[PDB]
């Protein structure tokens, strides 16, 4: 019966809320009030990477911490040489509309995708020395928003059809399909162990999914608007989510309840991308205000402003060694802050 | 200094820059339009997931992008089309019941933050069906739009070559509704060119060409005069 199902769902939600309230023994702010805050973290544009002739929509840092990708609206996926700013490669995309760009952990393949609903994996280490579409995964009914390389052969992708798909590059088939989201999924990050991943949806909900089990484990709410980006903590027991409300949030997996919130009351623009430092002390995030704020994850206090761009900021990322904070903006220029 | 490998890499980067600039110059001439409308409208049959069509008039090339399948809320993917030259909007003017839904959709697409600088083209479609319906008189627009009862055609407007008074009144009422929804906001950098077209009309892409020319001229004048 529909009424019985609704009553059961309401009872389960009430029980979950009561358990979360009971588990809220203390608060992160009170505990961290005894620690010494960092003072006025300032950064400068060490290297500026240009060449793109249209807006930049995505970026990924290579495992080597020296090469990074950038996808534009002009159907160009450029692999740079940040240490020297040389353009290592420039792949002309089949479709000019690309919304994501992922670099393989081994530096062998690069994944791109946008409104085409097709994830194109290009192989870089070709015998002929050229770059070509290694594979083209299809099956999503909506635009592909976020995608990451789980492994050299397994790739997990998120689309606008409210579902996520773990494919197989060798077989080009949907190994697993995860559904349940009531809105478009726009965020996806891979955990350090590459076993669990959190995806945010337009319904202001972040769902944790297991690569093997492939079943939802926890659902985190609290945001008043759509979620645009999510990133894991370096430890792996917590993550952060950014929405259009102009305030970031930090949740803990084990606690299952919201831990921290980050806002200043002087910021009204939405968050486009967030990232974590090597030690996880920082909460670098972007805004439509043409700047990035160095949010303090453990103190929820602003440190500095990387005001260098002229337009919106789309992508933000931090190298594995925590030595580069390269970001990208719609001005068609990347910038490496340090 | 820089070793031989570094110099070769720099030369490769310069060559890549040359190729990119050549491609950009080649692709900058064309103009990108975003085709929007409802299922009832005649979106596809206007100019003689993604579905892009290319057509050239007067030595000017237009790429019309017809993103489809992403119904309901257009957000999270309209942001891509924040640089297009115009949103070719198509609405079936014959259906009175669906007119209010079309007006709501136009309101949503007109006040959107990321589209606060592009000018739509209304392309009131299916003229013949509306003319036949109004001539028959079986369906009354006043049922769904009571204001139309007190509405009279403007006295300074130019009547069509042979349009009847009732058809002209209905056409002008629809156009006035859409234009009024257009002018409630966006004081500058916003226009709602309301062309009125029939199901078959060879001189159709010409209207898009003229309106794109006007939009470009207006933005150029705005830039020149603002400073």
């Amino acid at each position: 019966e529909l009424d019985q199902l609704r009553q059961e769902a309401e009872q389960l939600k009430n029980q979950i809320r009561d358990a979360r309230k009971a588990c809220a023994d203390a608060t992160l702010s009170q505990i961290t009030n005894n620690i010494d805050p960092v003072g006025r973290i300032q950064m400068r544009t060490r290297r500026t990477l240009r060449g793109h002739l249209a807006k930049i929509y995505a970026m990924h840092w290579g495992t080597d911490s020296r090469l990074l990708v950038s996808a534009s609206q002009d159907g160009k996926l450029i692999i740079w040489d940040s240490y020297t700013t040389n353009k290592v490669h420039a792949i002309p995309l089949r479709s000019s509309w690309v919304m994501t760009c992922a670099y393989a952990p081994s530096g062998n393949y690069v994944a791109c995708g946008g409104l085409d609903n097709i994830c194109s994996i290009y192989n870089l280490k070709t015998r002929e020395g050229n770059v070509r579409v290694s594979r083209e995964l299809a099956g999503h009914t909506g635009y592909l928003s976020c995608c990451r390389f789980l492994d050299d052969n397994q790739i997990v992708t998120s689309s606008g059809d409210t579902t996520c798909a773990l494919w197989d590059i060798e077989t080009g088939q949907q190994t697993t399909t995860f559904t349940g989201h009531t809105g478009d999924v726009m965020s996806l990050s891979l955990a350090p162990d590459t076993r669990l991943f959190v995806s945010g949806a337009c319904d202001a909900s972040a769902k944790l999914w297991d690569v093997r089990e492939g079943m939802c484990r926890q659902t985190f709410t609290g945001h008043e608007s759509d979620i645009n980006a999510i990133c894991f903590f370096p430890n792996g027991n917590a993550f952060a989510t950014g929405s259009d409300d102009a305030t970031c949030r930090l949740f803990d997996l084990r606690a299952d309840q919201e831990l921290m919130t980050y806002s200043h009351d002087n910021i009204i623009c939405g968050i486009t991308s967030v990232s974590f430092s090597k030690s996880g002390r920082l909460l670098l995030a972007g805004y439509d205000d043409f700047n990035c704020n160095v949010w303090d994850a453990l103190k929820a206090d602003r440190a500095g402003v990387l005001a260098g761009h002229d337009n919106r900021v789309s992508c933000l990322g931090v190298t594995d060694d925590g030595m580069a904070v390269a970001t990208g903006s719609w001005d068609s220029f990347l910038k490496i802050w340090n | 200094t820089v070793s031989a490998e570094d110099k070769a890499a720099a030369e490769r980067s310069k060559m890549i820059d040359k190729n990119l600039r050549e491609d950009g110059e080649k692709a900058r001439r064309t103009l990108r339009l975003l085709l929007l409308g409802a299922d009832n409208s005649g979106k596809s049959t206007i100019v003689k997931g993604i579905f892009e069509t290319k057509f050239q008039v007067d030595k000017v090339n237009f790429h019309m992008f017809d993103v489809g399948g992403q119904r309901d809320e257009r957000r999270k993917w309209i942001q891509c089309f924040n640089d297009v030259t115009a949103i070719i909007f198509v609405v079936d003017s014959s259906d009175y019941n669906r007119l209010q839904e079309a007006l709501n959709d136009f309101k949503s697409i007109w006040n959107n933050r990321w589209l606060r600088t592009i000018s739509v083209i209304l392309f009131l479609n299916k003229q013949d069906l509306l003319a036949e319906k109004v001539l028959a008189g079986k369906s009354k627009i006043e049922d769904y739009f009571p204001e139309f009862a007190r509405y009279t055609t403007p006295e300074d407007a130019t009547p069509e070559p042979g349009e009847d008074p009732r058809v002209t009144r209905a056409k002008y009422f629809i156009r006035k509704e859409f234009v009024d929804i257009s002018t409630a906001s966006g004081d500058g950098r916003h226009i709602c060119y309301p062309h009125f077209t029939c199901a078959v009309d060879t001189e159709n892409a010409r209207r898009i060409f003229n309106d794109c020319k006007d939009i470009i001229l207006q933005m150029n004048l705005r830039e020149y005069n603002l400073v």
Partner: single-chain antibody, 232 residues
């Protein structure tokens, strides 16, 4: 991948000749070309190099104003024009394709070699002391190559290339940059260095793994090859 060189033959002293080299199976226009000269008795010796797009052209100090290198990308061909050939020019010429970028493998492929018979300062002095190191299959062997200059730029990259030329075959790249192994070669080969002396170590030998080992430097032109060590 395929590089076929032709045009060689018998040329009298003081004459002129043209050597053609056709490339297929890969993007020739994106790969720089090198002409490697191997004497009947001496080892490999760089002659000329042309970068992608013909922007940069380098010639060996031995041949100046006589050897011209050109490339035709639409025809995917490489031409070497030699004028006023002398006795010393008698040697075998090989085409080598190299692509320069971060993580690349220069000198990945070599040509089959075309013979040519003629009737009748401030340069690295890399020397290979080893001349003959007979071994037995199943054992481990070591080869040492010394350089007169520190082949370690400030960037931290050691510009060394170890090549192997088995009998009846053209030279094949084994190791590039002294750290990364070539593509397709077995993992047994191991390169090590300290900035002045470099060593190749093979844990297990094989019938196919036999020939002449050459050490070359790419720190700065002109390229200089080692004396060459032959196993047995």
């Amino acid at each position: 991948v395929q590089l076929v060189e032709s045009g060689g033959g018998l040329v009298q002293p003081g004459g002129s000749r043209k050597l053609s080299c056709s490339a297929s199976g890969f993007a020739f226009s994106s790969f720089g070309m090198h002409w490697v000269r191997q004497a009947p008795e001496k080892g490999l010796e760089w002659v000329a190099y042309i970068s992608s797009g013909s922007g940069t052209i380098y010639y060996a100090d031995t041949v100046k104003g006589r050897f011209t290198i050109s490339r035709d990308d639409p025809k995917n061909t490489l031409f070497l024009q030699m004028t006023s050939l002398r006795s010393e020019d008698t040697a075998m010429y090989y085409c080598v394709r190299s692509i320069y970028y971060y993580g690349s493998s220069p000198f990945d492929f070599w040509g089959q070699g075309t013979t040519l018979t003629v009737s009748s300062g401030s340069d690295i002095v890399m020397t290979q002391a080893t001349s003959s190191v007979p071994v037995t299959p199943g054992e481990s062997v070591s080869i040492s190559c010394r350089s007169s200059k520190s082949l370690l730029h400030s960037n931290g990259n050691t510009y060394l290339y170890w090549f192997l030329q088995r009998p009846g075959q053209s030279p094949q790249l084994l190791i590039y940059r002294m750290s990364n192994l070539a593509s397709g070669v077995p993992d047994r080969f191991s390169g090590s260095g300290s900035g002045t002396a470099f060593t190749l170590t093979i844990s297990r030998l094989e019938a196919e793994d036999v020939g002449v080992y050459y050490c070359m430097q790419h720190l700065e032109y002109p390229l200089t090859f080692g004396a060459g060590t032959k196993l047995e």
